[PDB]
């Protein structure tokens, strides 16, 4: 019987920037392809700066741990706007950073920016090492731009 | 030893709209004030269209269930861009909607829009009824604009 | 200092069948495209018969509830090898089916088979109704085969 | 048909002390303002000594990890009545303290007292370091009193 | 190297009222004793108005479901300041109340007050029916006062 | 440097009764065999009266929902010492029983007793119906005794 | 229409030993009393060897972290049949023990035995140190026997 | 009124390999028997390479922590195709591996292969040490083949 909703405006509003789903998909697929080429089996995830996972892809033959790991890696990379390889080394002086929920301070995640600000993280997991995971995440990032 | 991150651009990017924290705070505080005036004790929550909770306020004397309820109500209102009072009545023909995670199909949540699109939900819980919760949520929405 | 692992064989082993990640991706992308064409904003998920999510895609402008909903819908469809639209109607005589963990008995999920057995479920959420979600899930399934 | 509830009294009862929602809000808003001034993007949380979160504010541009981190920091500070910067250093001799649920032994949380007893913790997260988070949490505490 | 914490005062503070642990224990033990006398095997819980569980007792021979049930019942009773037997009947007109987290709208929980305000809920579970659970919860409440 | 632990005795102690792991395994395997014979694919679970799961078996080709369902069914059957087929029908007059954590009021679970008291529940899930699940659970129970 | 349940017997059954609820309560209350005497504010928990929590008591003024900590400490002590003070020191050579779910390798938990086998753990948390927590847990254990 | 589902084929499909439930059961039972012989009380788990737990067995007298530990150990062993004893030692150079969800880098888990690829992990927990747990897991693996 009743209605209707309020419309905000002016300085009550601000805008944020994101990858399109199409771009995030393009990036994630590029990571898998690079891994599949090298005979690796990986899961890939793209997480928005807002915390939401935009894309996930579970590779054929990938380990059952790789899916969530890739997700947490992307989340970690976009949160601090840095490769998870780098972030893992801050734990020497700031070891309780890993106690932050949703994070995995392990190589395989790398950020993507727009106007110098992080908009997404691309996470990979499943390769024999996180550094190799990250190589594929970079390959994922590299189709974006340029 | 290594760096650096990729910059996306062009049609790989899109923008989204949100309430400012200041506006969301202003709205949430307005809901409490309206409840406090009528002698009610409530929790209030503002949830962004992206799913993230932007503001929560636990009223003095509020029930221990009101906090999470207000959060889920705001989440529900912004998800379907409608008052939770209305959404609760769709359950007659679509009863499994309540089985959607994060939702609470109970009066007390109302949406806020920008350019005809939902950007936030304002949720309230603690009053003797959800319809009264919603009155205060509307009072919260009403300071935005106009 | 020590090793190594045991190798099973013979009737101790059996094989299972799955969609490739490439096929699951192709299907999920087809669902989004069909929704985007009709101006809808949806999340899509492909879940393997083994319970594992293989692909997720969060549409631009999709509701924050759509992601997990699509996942649970695909899981539900592949578990019972039936559209979630159909499964929702069994609740009249079997109402406690919805109490099964991981399920969402709501239109939007449809199964994919191999040799008459379910191998994947395709789930969609975000459209004004689950029946419309399911139309797009069918469009997703339809690029597979034929 | 039936009623009614029992009323306790005398030495069966005791009283506890808390910040008002208005005071907790005032403090949390003061932390954001101090961060916003220095160009930082942070989430802020005020947690009661009873464990309940009273206020949360998610700053514009804040990292998606900052919200829960600020909450756990405030919880940690009020639990031990000490800055989380200090508490993080006890881990050298008591490293399993971090294994306590709900805690984050990382700078950014500081306690607030009443009659020499902790009543609230103020947590901040999002700045380049926890020590800087804590500076803003102190600014939040500083509007209370004096 | 650094310190120290802020002290709040005046109208920045408010007081709340609670059962003592001794009183809550006395009540919970009285419920068990009444059940044990009638040959029943039950779990008992006392939950504070702030949401925190103060006391739990798992009866010998009690069902493995009774512990958490008693907890949720006490939480539900103190949240709405009413017997869970009564609250269960509001579901006819307000069926989505049960969707509130932490609740169990089933007989066995009854509130305890101080100055006309709820301070605790006493929950019982394990007897052949919730109405019988509630009888024992009332016996628990009855040693308080009078 | 320090020790040692206290030894309780007398009326401070009581004994409880359980199925052996060997018996629970024998029963669970008998359920699978009966299902496999009829061409059904099911998961089976044996849960102790204390709430602990003693045995689980995931059938080949079983649905991904069957594992947890069988567990919750066994838990439900041993909690109320009755078939879940029967317990599902109490929901007409006691519909909030399903809101008890850990439960699934759906046919497929049946209790096992010792000295007239429940000691275990045997749960099955995966067949086209819960009544058929329960037939196999009974076959599981039937190898015990007699 | 149908019934009835199977009765196991013989070597299909085994018996286990436990503290009575009365004994567990007596012990937990003794721990609080010893802490209250020394002016400490603590939560206490008694956990059965089967994993189930039998008793919890939240002290007046206790920290909001103490409740769950005491529970995990009791669980840890009864799992390994040793003081958590001792168990914390095994982490030097076996550091991944803390990664076991439900555990907290921190002083405050001590086991109780029957016939040389663990039957319960008594956990305490809230004092300025775990060693002091454990002193009170020992006082709790000491009223049992002798 | 509507139907029916799509059938995938060709290169849209791939096959995976698994232990049969019968083989997994045979292995798990062999581990228990070897432990029971040496007077040890353990829980055993077999987890598929896809992440799903196929078999669990809770030994008589086993610690309440052993069940989940064995599960996580099997999951960890099959994820990296290596004994958890070995994997625990990678933490020296890759310490954040333990932060991967679902894992427990502690001796007691060993992999089983088919065609040089991991298909299952066998996990054991409860013995005085993980190395001894692993001995029994190997005994479990050893009945498979040869």
**CB-based contact (8 Å) between H1 and chain C?**
no
Contact F99 E106 (CB under 8 A): yes
Q: How many CB atoms lie within 10 A of CB H99?
A: 18
Q: Is the dihedral of CA D134, D135, D137, D138 positive or negative?
A: positive
Q: What is the dihedral of CA E29, E35, E41, E47, to 10 degrees?
A: -40
Quote the CA–CA distance of A80 and D65 in Å, as a whole number: 9
Angle E125-E128-E130 (CA atoms, 0-180°, nearest 5)?
50
Contact G57 E60 (CB under 8 A): no
Asked if residues D140 and D124 have their Cβ atoms less than 8 Å apart, the reply is yes
Q: How deeply is G61 buried, as exposed, middle or buried, from its count of CB atoms within 10 A (0-12, 13-18, 19+)?
A: middle
Quote the CA–CA distance of E91 and D113 in Å, as a whole number: 42
State whether residue D47 is helix, strand or coil: strand
Asked if residues G108 and G130 have their Cβ atoms less than 8 Å apart, the reply is yes
Quote the CA–CA distance of E84 and E65 in Å, as a whole number: 17
Does a structural domain hold residue H11?
no
Asked if residues C18 and C24 have their Cβ atoms less than 8 Å apart, the reply is no
Residue B123's beta-bridge partner residues?
B45, B109
Does a structural domain hold residue G4?
no
The pairing of beta strand A53-58 with beta strand B53-58: unpaired
DSSP state of B145: -
Asked if residues H65 and G104 have their Cβ atoms less than 8 Å apart, the reply is no
Angle of helix D21-37 versus helix B21-37 axis, rounded to 10? 170
DSSP state of F37: H
Asked if residues D45 and D74 have their Cβ atoms less than 8 Å apart, the reply is yes
Does a structural domain hold residue H121?
yes
Contact B53 D57 (CB under 8 A): no
Asked if residues E21 and E54 have their Cβ atoms less than 8 Å apart, the reply is yes
Quote the CA–CA distance of D110 and D107 in Å, as a whole number: 8
DSSP state of G130: H
Asked if residues H103 and H75 have their Cβ atoms less than 8 Å apart, the reply is yes
Nearest to G52 among E29, E54, E58 (CB): E58
Does a structural domain hold residue A100?
yes
The pairing of beta strand F109-114 with beta strand G6-7: parallel
**Touching chains C and F? (3+ Cβ pairs < 8 A):** yes
3-state helix, strand, coil in chain G (%, to 5): 40, 25, 35
**Touching chains D and C? (3+ Cβ pairs < 8 A):** no
Quote the CA–CA distance of D47 and A34 in Å, as a whole number: 47
**For this experimental structure, what is the resolution in angstroms?**
2.0
Asked if residues C13 and H119 have their Cβ atoms less than 8 Å apart, the reply is yes
The shortest C-alpha distance from B29 to chain C (Å) reads 24
Nearest to D6 among E82, E116, E145 (CB): E145
Contact C112 H5 (CB under 8 A): yes
Asked if residues C56 and C47 have their Cβ atoms less than 8 Å apart, the reply is no
Nearest to G102 among H60, H65, H103 (CB): H65
Peptide bond into B128 cis (omega under 30): no
Q: How many CB atoms lie within 10 A of CB G37?
A: 10
Which structure tokens are listed for G131?
A: 């060693």
Asked if residues D103 and D75 have their Cβ atoms less than 8 Å apart, the reply is yes
The shortest C-alpha distance from A29 to chain C (Å) reads 9
Asked if residues E71 and E120 have their Cβ atoms less than 8 Å apart, the reply is no
**CB-based contact (8 Å) between A121 and chain C?**
no
CA distances from G107 to E109, G42, G99, G121 (A): 35, 14, 17, 12
Asked if residues H45 and H51 have their Cβ atoms less than 8 Å apart, the reply is no
* Element containing residue F32 per DSSP (H, E): helix F21-37
Q: Going edge to edge, which strands form the sheet with G6-7?
A: C6-7, H109-114, H117-125, H43-48, H53-58, F53-58, F43-48, F117-125, F109-114, G6-7
Q: In chain G, at which residue ranges do the beta strands (DSSP E only) sit?
A: 6-7, 13-19, 43-48, 53-58, 109-114, 117-125
The shortest C-alpha distance from E46 to chain B (Å) reads 14
Residue span of the structural domain in which E109 resides: 20-146
Which structure tokens are listed for G120?
A: 């319960």
Does a structural domain hold residue F14?
no
Residue F124's beta-bridge partner residues?
F44
Which structure tokens are listed for A49?
A: 């700066």
CA distances from H15 to G140, H10, H18, H90 (A): 58, 11, 10, 32
- Give helix then strand counts, H and E, for chain A: 4, 6
Q: Which of residues 60-119 of C touch A (CB under 8 A)?
A: 60, 64, 67
Picking from H61, H70, H69, H47, the residue whose alpha carbon sits closest to that of residue H124 is H70
Question: Any idea what the CATH number is for the domain that residue F134 is in?
Answer: 3.30.450.150
Which structure tokens are listed for H70?
A: 């064995």
Contact D5 E145 (CB under 8 A): no
3-state secondary structure chain E: CCCCCEECCHHHEEEEEEECHHHHHHHHHHHHHHHHHCCCCCEEEEEECCCCEEEEEECCCCCCCHHHHHHHHHHHHHHHCCCHHHHCCHHHCCHHHHHCCCCCCCCCEEEEEECCEEEEEEEEECCCCHHHHHHHHHHHHHCCCC
State whether residue D91 is helix, strand or coil: helix
HSE, CB side, 13 Å, CA atoms: give it for residue G88.
22
Does a structural domain hold residue F11?
no
Q: What is the number of CB-based contacts under 8 A between chain E and chain F?
A: 46
* Element containing residue H26 per DSSP (H, E): helix H21-37
Which structure tokens are listed for G4?
A: 């009835």
Does a structural domain hold residue G8?
no
Does a structural domain hold residue C134?
yes
- Roughly how many angstroms between the first and final C-alpha of chain C, as a whole number? 53
- Unique residue bearing structure tokens 């009774």: E66
Quote the CA–CA distance of A47 and B1 in Å, as a whole number: 25
Quote the CA–CA distance of F86 and B16 in Å, as a whole number: 52
Residues 6 or more apart whose CB falls under 8 angstroms from that of B99 comprise C98, C103, C104, C105, C106
Phi then psi dihedrals of residue H47, to 5 deg: -115, 130
Quote the CA–CA distance of A47 and A125 in Å, as a whole number: 14
Q: How many CB atoms lie within 10 A of CB H116?
A: 7
Q: How many domains does chain H have?
A: 1
3-state secondary structure chain C: CCCCCEECCHHHEEEEEEECHHHHHHHHHHHHHHHHHCCCCCEEEEEECCCCEEEEEECCCCCCCHHHHHHHHHHHHHHHCCCHHHHCCHHHCCHHHHHCCCCCCCCCEEEEEECCEEEEEEEEECCCCHHHHHHHHHHHHHCCCC
Asked if residues E122 and E140 have their Cβ atoms less than 8 Å apart, the reply is yes
Residues of H in contact with C82 (CB under 8 A): 5
A13 torsion bin: left (phi>0), alpha (psi -120 to 50), beta (else):
beta
- Unique residue bearing structure tokens 């403090």: D27
Nearest to A13 among B13, B19, B51 (CB): B19
Q: What is the number of CB-based contacts under 8 A between chain F and chain G?
A: 133
Quote the CA–CA distance of C111 and C87 in Å, as a whole number: 12
Which structure tokens are listed for E94?
A: 């307000």
């Amino acid at each position: 019987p009743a209605a209707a909703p309020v419309a905000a405006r002016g300085g009550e509003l601000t805008q944020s920037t994101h990858l399109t789903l199409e771009a995030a998909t393009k990036a994630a697929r590029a990571a898998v392809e690079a891994a599949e080429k090298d005979g690796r089996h990986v899961s890939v995830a793209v997480v928005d700066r807002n915390g939401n996972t935009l894309v996930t892809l579970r590779g054929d033959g990938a380990g059952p741990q790789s899916y969530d790991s890739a997700d947490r890696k992307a989340f970690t990379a976009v949160s601090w706007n840095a490769p998870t390889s780098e972030l893992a080394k801050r734990l020497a002086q700031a070891p309780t950073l890993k106690d932050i929920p949703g994070t995995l301070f392990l190589a395989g995640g790398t950020p993507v920016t727009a106007k110098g600000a992080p908009v997404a993280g691309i996470g990979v997991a499943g390769a024999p090492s996180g550094d190799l995971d990250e190589q594929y995440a970079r390959a994922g990032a590299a189709v974006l731009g340029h």
